[model samples]
Target chain A: SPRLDCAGRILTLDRPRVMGIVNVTPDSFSDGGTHTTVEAAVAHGLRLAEEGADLLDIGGESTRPGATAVPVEEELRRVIPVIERLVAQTALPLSVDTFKPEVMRAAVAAGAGMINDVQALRQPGALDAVADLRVPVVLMHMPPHYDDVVAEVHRFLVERIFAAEMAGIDKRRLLIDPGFGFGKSTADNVQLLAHLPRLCELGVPVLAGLSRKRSIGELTGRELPEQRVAGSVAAHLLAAQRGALLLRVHDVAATVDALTVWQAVQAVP
Target chain B: TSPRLDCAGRILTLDRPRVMGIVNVTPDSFSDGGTHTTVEAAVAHGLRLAEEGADLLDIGGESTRPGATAVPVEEELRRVIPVIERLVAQTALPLSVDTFKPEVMRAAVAAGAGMINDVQALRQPGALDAVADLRVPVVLMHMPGDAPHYDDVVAEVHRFLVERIFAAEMAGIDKRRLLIDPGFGFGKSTADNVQLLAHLPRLCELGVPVLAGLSRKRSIGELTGRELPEQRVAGSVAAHLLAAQRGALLLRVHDVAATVDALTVWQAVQAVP
Candidate 1:
């Protein structure tokens, strides 16, 4: 099978690929302050890459619920330097984690490999920016004040994928991300993650970013971000078997190791 | 974890939780490294692992034990080359060379070593280039600290592997040609090894093959309170099953055939449910 082509690289999605999270913001929902400095962010990116991450997703903005967005200028100021350093230093794919069109364009211009938009590139000009850049874009499904988030997210992603395709983005380059807790309630996130396989019906690869999300702690009752590693890995394993091609996670190594086992299980034939 | 034995371009997918016989060529290896110093003994042991149902055979020239001194390149080359030559001629099983030196990598490959298992993870200068040039499969393992330690070892190990894998690719190594190892006994505390084993699935996210080497080691003895290495078979078998369920692809061990039989039964049970 031809692996899903992301950016200029072909990620042979034979098994679930781990995407390490490098949050450059100061108030990320979890481990936000850890990599605030440019050096720290670079080191953390390298470390995550070392821990067996297939790709590194660097975000200058925190998408935590109730958290305010980081301005486009500040977001670029925080992530561009780090992205430049990572591009120079590593061969791993670098993903720009953002929803703003301005930051998206700047990141793509500065050699970012992929764009992981939480809002599914629905913001005005977001699609245009990504389409112009011609890089692989992760179109997530985030409902607005919905009573049933999954059904709404399902429709949202289907439409979003179509929109991305119409905007000159190759269908294969478009990865569908089911926003776990962007605007949905805790139950909604759980339902979406539990039935992630159904989302694979869209004929696009699925990327699930469930690392240290509030819904995980709500389900497992573990508040500490570090403590949520195991639970996050569990979610990753379940999703991988169910056909999630890419997993955006905070704890890279643990997730990579877990997927190794998942692939081992699936390679039984 | 089963052994995805790639022998002479043919992949023999062993049953899950299969065994890989370990043949060490180092002169001062702590366990069996020195035991197979001669090509005769090395080939003998390689065949024995196959007879024992060992799906693969891992042959190492350099010792990765912490503070373990290094052997000069010529000696390291001499130690593994002849053994690989003899083993390749003697058996159809896949042969993996355990060394980090680029020189040894080329020598081993020329001598018919199919896989390169490096403790340094092909990170040394020209190490990645060597493997990339050869186009041979490589296993990048993670060890903590400057030498290998227990301090938050599992997390550190995972981090190290991710970095090394990047290095491998930057040097032109392909993703399909890469595998990862947790290096169970290398610089890991008992607690660290346990945590890593307990969370084997976490390593899978890297999207590469994973190899688990927990065959009849001191950690198994310590975990099970079995003082003698020979008495650690039950612990080793249990560890294999645990690692297999968690998603290990290769099992590096001393008793290959025995482990293979045990895994067969375990795999059958997995099929039942």
Candidate 2:
């Protein structure tokens, strides 16, 4: 049942697992960011767990294009308490989403079992920091532009994989994310998704994070996130069909139910 | 066999799943429930569905539900013929007459209905010859002769449709002008309905377009846990989407806009890169 180790705990990748984004990550559309932010984040994660989320992603910073980055101190303050309390209360594996080496170290110390770094851990000390931590690290691709996107993703992720190994991190303790909407145009994102099996060939679990992105809205012809459900599910389900192991999303139950129905049909003889 | 179905001269492309909006013109005399509309109101509703992106529209004068009392030939003709005539004149989209009787089929087709959707699968007297003589595309559905039950529901229905397919071909009808629907929620058990949905691909092996009419039906309500039929739109959309993915070429639905959007999303995903 366990293929990928997350700090001595295991997340089953036998089937497409849903990783619910707990958007403790900033967004005006998210619930709130005031004094109640920590509790609000915890409540959302709890609801996601009830909805069949295999894992939870807790982050303080926003990864969307043009969102302001959180400083290391603010990021640490924002996530550490939530991570600490959640790790104590919730049994689901928690992945800390941050690229800052300092925040990653603090979050890991606060009991986070995984690191989902959008910057591919390119920040200073990030690689060595992960090398010291015995947990799964998700290295994602997000650049300012893409040329020969699928090939570039393959080469870039391969280099980062080697770099992590050089820094003493085990190859088995790695997951690769083809970060959708990071900096690629819609066409480039489509290319990355179409060639997801190439990423799967890199000998690591592939995390597909395309929940409520602009391209989904573009395809569904609706600008609102609420209207992007079917499109988002379609894209994620396609990724699952193409060999993605982890599906990151905002709608946990919907993703889980869709995957369940698709898998159930696959079982019908 | 061609990716397109020519309803007389109007061509319905089957390269993608086409949405067929349901228009029931009968009154709610059962007092039990359903969409009730006058002739002009029915024509207006068809127009709205067209505006909502329905690829085609179907007009039914008689209620085919189990307990639905039969409408006389004159009354059925009066109710549906004018709607088909009026709505057909307004839109270039193809109109299908949902009737099993030969007289209604002849009259509706003469009034510009482009297709025939028979619940009885042309088992009624003269239906087979009527569809054969009319020369329009006809959708033959399996409502069963169950409460009405089956030993193996899917295989039973599959065999049933296979026989009907041969029967249609044996008559004067061209094989290319036929589509089959394994009718859901007519008189089968819920398990039977589920079995048919999961095995629709085997039905598609018959080399004809499949029309899935689970729209706002009792089965959708049972699946979604919503007691009301109209409130089951989301469930219906998901069900039909799965059916289309499984090889259904036509989705007969009540929620036209939602089905169109969901189908668009599925098509985009299917396109991939």
Best by TM-score: 2
Residue A178 displacement (Å), model 1: 1.0
Which CAPRI quality tier does the interface of model 2 achieve? incorrect
What DockQ was computed for model 1? 0.01
Model 1: per-residue Cα lDDT over A100-122, one tens digit each = 99888888778787888888877
Clashing pairs in 2: B146-B149
Q: Candidate 1 — what's its lDDT?
A: 0.78
lDDT of each: 0.78, 0.84
Kindly list the per-residue Cα lDDT of model 2 for residues B52-159, writing each as its tens digit.
888999999898776777788999999899999998889888899999889999999999998999998899899988998889999989986514778888898889
Q: Worst 10-residue stretch by lDDT in candidate 2 chain B?
A: B28-37
Candidate 2 residue-wise lDDT at A234: 85
**Weakest ten-residue segment in model 1 chain A by summed lDDT:** A27-36
